[PDB]
Ligand binder design. Sequence first.
Ligand code: HEM
Ligand SMILES: O=C(O)c1ccc(-n2cncn2)cc1
Ligand SMILES: [Cl-]
Length: 393
Amino acid sequence: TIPHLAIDPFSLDFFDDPYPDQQTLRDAGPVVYLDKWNVYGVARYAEVHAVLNDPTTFCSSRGVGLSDFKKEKPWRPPSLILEADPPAHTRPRAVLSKVLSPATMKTIRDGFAAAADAKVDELLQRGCIDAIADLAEAYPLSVFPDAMGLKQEGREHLLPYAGLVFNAFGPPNELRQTAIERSAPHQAYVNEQCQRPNLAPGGFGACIHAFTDTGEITPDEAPLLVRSLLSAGLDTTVNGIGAAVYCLARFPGELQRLRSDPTLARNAFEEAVRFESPVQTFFRTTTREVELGGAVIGEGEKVLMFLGSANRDPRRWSDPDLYDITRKTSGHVGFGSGVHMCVGQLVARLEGEVMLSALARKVAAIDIDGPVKRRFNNTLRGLESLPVKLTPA
Ligand code: HEM
Ligand SMILES: O=C(O)c1ccc(-n2cncn2)cc1
Ligand SMILES: [Cl-]
């Protein structure tokens, strides 16, 4: 009843160009079985959205990677928010929601915007730059560690640690095994910065620790919740901003529309998140036998969701393979959906918006002018190098 496919969604060939195989996964059926890894797969929007929104049946506390925490030891202590289900999830979630709240965005917007404008001005002086190292990486590195309250020393550990986190959601392939092999120094740095004395006043980290006297979290929970922001909040924005620049570089007509109305900046970024989906996949584990899209899945089974595929499913989107900065993007699953829907989405959108605003106001053309190189990760989609010439407006 359920079709069995040999596609390996964690192979380099798949990362290099996932879209044909994603159509094969959607068109094979609402639910497939991936023989390579002994997991169920769902690649259509409807079932991805259904799974995300039934956290009781499709739980997160047995891990959102391939590994089942009921069978194997997690490679690091479980996340108190990502790898927890209601009700344990609920209070740590509320703390992070308040730390990264609508009201908090007002305190950081001016500095984030000024840093975005300054970076674009700097890049225009060079003309030919690498939109990954010099922009997608450099801009978040210039604002987010400081917003966290991190010291300057050791920040070179942050992107490697995040890449490790996202590789570790994958199967035990070479990408994952190599990441874990190299991890000890990055884990040591990150765990230490999570302790209250090492987080500067007024930053996100200190604000998490300040919530430990409300009864929502205890003091021994705060370091792991700081760990969550350092895990989830940098590399993702790098790939999101990188995707947006890549889209504007490939679709000059949309850059021209964005220049003509810079208030489209926020939706241009949201559309980039739909179109490239920086977080491509992740897993749930069934807690009972369940019927999903006409198929029966047993208890204790890993289910792999394809967020990027759901965001390109023609059953849900008109012209899904077009980058359209005026698209009604509401409902895309690039930030997830439901109780775990990205708690840092307002920080992500703020960064993306202010960067695309700076480009909209200051740049007349973005032309790829060198070899484009992809960056391979078991969970994240993004580029390693994006050589572009920026022409000033
Ligand atoms: C473009 C940037 C980003 C993308 C594409 C993205 C994507 C996602 C997705 C898909 C999830 C859901 C995972 C799941 O349901 O298992 C998630 C959760 C999460 N994200 Fe993001 N994210 C981004 C930025 C950020 C930022 C900036 C932060 C923090 C500053 C952050 C922190 C988190 C946390 C803590 C969770 C877990 C929330 C929970 O489990 O309730 N993310 N993110
Ligand atoms: O709590 C953490 O450590 C954490 C939270 C979320 C994620 N993400 C997974 N997919 C997208 N974000 C990774 C780590
Ligand atoms: Cl760690």
